[PDB]
Write a protein that binds this ligand. Structure first.
Ligand SMILES: O=C(O)CCC(=O)C(=O)O
Ligand code: PRO
Ligand SMILES: [Fe+3]
Length: 267
């Protein structure tokens, strides 16, 4: 049987990723593949227990660490459409630091405050450097009006930015109101210098973005959902210092075994 040979990014695509801190590949997965991922996401929301977050409404907001519990999601992170590019960009073997599905229901979502993901991973999880990235799979078309991820392009180039801390514990690392949000003034400067961009794309697209790029999103006023599957790949050399870790495995992985690609089988 045959998997399609590993595809990697072009030099131009790599350059664009390093400069901007994000990159969209359209139509990586087809509709049937997206429907399978959507059905598995629904199962995870229903059966995820303590791994599930909820929104004012008690409506499901997020589920975490699904690659450890779902055979489908365990295979997805090894996909030949994903793993080769993560290896290319991080210039290493890689593993999954974090996995989450963020629902942003039609008419329903919440405001994710400005943040850098690395700030959490560094301070909560002991990630020593920002040699990590996230792949966001669009389960639905992402538009202007359904609460797209919004970035400051080039905003990753200064590194970790000083952030207000709010409360001990980790409960508020997954909430609308975030543990590390960005100085109102620091953001103004960044945006005045670099601007703001919300990448769009059809269902089945993949949005790659740097661990350190500032991002945000608003509620969904469209009649259409905005499901994102977010896979955070980390360089194996950049494995986190488990002695400085504070969160469970379904938020911050502790098995640093290098991922290998999915091969074709008869089942
Ligand atoms: O789903 C969103 O709009 C925000 C996701 C995010 O930035 C995060 O979970 O860190
Ligand atoms: O706590 C975490 O790791 C994720 C990434 C930043 C927001 N929540
Ligand atoms: Fe984030």
């Amino acid at each position: 049987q045959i998997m399609e040979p590993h595809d990697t990014l072009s030099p131009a695509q790599v350059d664009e990723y390093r400069k901007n801190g994000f990159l969209v590949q359209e139509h990586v997965f087809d509709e049937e593949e997206i429907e399978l991922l959507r059905a598995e996401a629904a199962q995870e929301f229903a059966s995820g227990g303590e791994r599930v977050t909820v929104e004012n409404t008690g409506i499901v907001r997020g589920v975490h660490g699904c690659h450890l519990y779902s055979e489908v999601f365990g295979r997805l992170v090894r996909s030949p459409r994903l793993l080769p590019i993560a290896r290319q960009l991080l210039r290493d073997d890689v593993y999954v630091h974090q996995f989450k599905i963020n629902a942003k229901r039609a008419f329903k979502g919440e405001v994710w405050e400005w943040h850098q993901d690395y700030t959490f991973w560094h301070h909560e999880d002991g990630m020593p450097a920002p040699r990590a990235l996230s792949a966001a799979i669009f389960l639905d078309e992402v538009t202007e009006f359904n609460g797209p991820l919004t970035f400051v392009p080039g905003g990753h180039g200064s590194g970790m930015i000083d952030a207000d801390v709010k409360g001990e514990g980790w409960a508020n690392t997954l909430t609308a109101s975030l543990k590390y949000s960005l100085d109102v003034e620091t953001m103004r400067g960044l945006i005045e210098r670099n601007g703001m961009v919300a990448p769009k794309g059809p269902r089945g697209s993949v949005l790659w973005f740097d661990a350190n790029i500032p991002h945000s999103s608003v509620p969904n006023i469209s009649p259409f959902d905005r499901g994102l599957v977010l896979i955070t790949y980390n360089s194996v050399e950049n494995k986190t210092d488990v002695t400085r870790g504070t969160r469970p495995e379904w938020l911050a992985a502790r098995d640093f075994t290098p991922l290998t690609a999915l091969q074709a089988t008869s089942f």
